[PDB]
Symmetry: C3
Subunit: 271 residues, 3 copies
């Protein structure tokens, strides 16, 4: 029980060049382990929404990074599925009691790392959830989807097949990728680099969003970046060059709906 956990993590970070899996003190190992435990349980989270703005806790990212530095790789598994890594998986040693307490389903061969929070009534189809991620209640993670490090996934989100939510560990100051409540992310879409998809939005298949992806609002004719406004319906499109010789792909907002519409219209029917 550190006197101040954040301060211990921050001073260990400053001392990180001198930390290894052999030389690290019990004090620092316990502080890091306690932080990862808190992430795993959802008592801590890398980013949270305060005063309607997402805030990042850099000290928690430092703990995650120190947890890599403080552990050696170890042989895991057996038979034709041997592995060699330094991050424990989330469900190692779980039995019925632990899984029942968690309230979620893990469909084989889904894997999550220790230090990811998975809420009740989540379904993990074969998929990957990396350390630091937060997957809130009722969310569906479909087959070969990925929830990257530190990503914040809201309640009742649908991550369709092959969807990737990009991790953001470094830079320390950078907010993680955020999918807010009740979003639908269509198959093969990718949202990376701390893009925020606000609540009730719908991404069609094949939408790729990074900080440099142009988001063209069809109704207004305006280009923006980095954020899908709440309730937006987004599809892949393109914008022409000035001389008409070619176009570059972008995302296009083709309409915007409210929460009532999302409850009374199926995703299939929203287009």
């Amino acid at each position: 029980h550190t006197l101040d956990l954040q301060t211990t993590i921050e001073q260990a970070w400053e001392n990180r060049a001198n930390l290894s899996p052999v030389d690290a003190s019990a004090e620092v190992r316990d502080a890091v382990e306690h932080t990862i435990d808190g992430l795993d349980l959802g008592r801590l989270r890398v980013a949270e929404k305060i005063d309607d703005q997402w805030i990042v806790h850099q000290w928690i990212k430092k703990a995650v990074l120190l947890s890599f530095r403080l552990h050696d790789n170890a042989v895991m598994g057996q038979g034709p599925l041997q592995f060699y890594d330094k991050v424990p998986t989330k469900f190692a040693g779980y039995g019925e009691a632990a899984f029942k307490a968690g309230g979620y389903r893990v469909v084989p061969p889904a894997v999550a790392r220790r230090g990811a929070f998975i809420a009740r009534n989540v379904v993990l189809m074969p998929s990957y959830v990396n350390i630091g991620a937060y997957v809130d209640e009722g969310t569906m993670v479909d087959t070969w989807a990925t929830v990257g490090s530190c990503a914040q996934i809201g309640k009742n989100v649908h991550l369709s097949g092959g969807v990737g939510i990009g991790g953001v560990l470094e830079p320390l100051q950078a907010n993680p990728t955020i999918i807010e409540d009740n979003c639908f992310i269509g198959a093969r879409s990718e949202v990376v680099e701390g893009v925020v998809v606000e609540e009730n939005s719908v991404l069609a298949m094949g939408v790729f969003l990074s900080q440099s992806t142009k988001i063209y609002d069809r109704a207004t004719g305006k280009v923006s970046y980095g954020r899908v406004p709440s309730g937006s319906v987004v599809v892949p499109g393109s914008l022409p060059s000035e001389d008409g010789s070619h176009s570059l792909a972008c995302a296009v907002i083709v309409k915007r709906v409210d929460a009532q519409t999302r409850a009374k219209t199926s995703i299939n029917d929203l287009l």
Copy 2:
């Protein structure tokens, strides 16, 4: 041996609010198990082609849905690969005799669920095949492809890397996604929501088809939805807005070939 299996399933469906993994009768459990067994063996199939139209068997979908309701989640696996789910995997308890009898290959870490049919001479690279799917003879399912629930995959189909074939369990009345014989589906493509790809067609990489995807026939200039006509070669493209400010992505049919051409021209050479 139910007197009428369909009727038993249909009356259990009507009674489903009163069915759980604790309270369900032997009669209903056996009827559901027999239906899933039939799906697993390919003696039953969720959809089939009759009089040259695909038909759906809603009672079989009801059985699949009841099989979820009637089973508790259970711990599966061990070591760094523990899972917790209520649907058995297809090959649990198989030995050499059972695999040899099936006539297909399962490359690690591919997984299929019980209740999916896999025909002889199929190769499952690392991939997922969900309950209710039917994968016919000679088909190749490449790495990180997905065959979703109830999807019907024809003979000698090539599902390339990262291809997803979307599941359709609900609505009960909806036909599943259909890939007919001898189709080639290029890497990262997605075909969902009961789209039918007719025989001998070729989808390039990155083609995404749902019921709302415009299919533009280049030769005729016409837009259609929901079906790729036999022998079509389909690539990603776009259609411009009336005012020229932007375009929206769509599928484009760039040519149409017959079965003789498909046998004498490689996929690489077809473009």
Copy 3:
């Protein structure tokens, strides 16, 4: 120790219709096994760069193909993860000593096949590496990426999430897909069919390259195929039809940078 390994492989190839897992001689089995061992260790490679041109060793491809013909399928694994295949996985029977000697990390549930070379300081996130692939030092293979058969991946390459590098075993004469040193391949991109991505290039998300993909150089207005010149920054775009009715998707080179720029600019910042 064959008198000439290449000649033994080439004569076994000529005799391949008469080779099976029951009838094959010790001489041929040993020659094939020795070739696969050499691939696995990186002492042999399917393609290599000589006089600044990539060359293919057809006899090595013949050995890989013979290794399939000479082995029966075998049950692998246990529990809810049973498999049935004829190619051993790379790490079967490895312990700590073998993994430490290799110098790479294998994050569960990543799998590689025997006969793929993985260099020191590689990280395999959950991903697949097929037989014959060569993955050089410092490369990151991210979640649900695929390195296909015979593909040559350079040093310090970043294969982002869901990236597929297509295999090329047949035709024997065809060069494999090549990703040269220090390339960044953005999420969901696909590079197949022996396309060469030259050193220091950057592919954005969603770039799909085959031999038939038009590569439009924005600065020059010229179309080429099959090769990304060194240092190119490539994004998805499209080219319009002559009559303006539609466009077809293509890759667009939007700038070209030198090695100094790649060291002093983040991938995020390069756009």
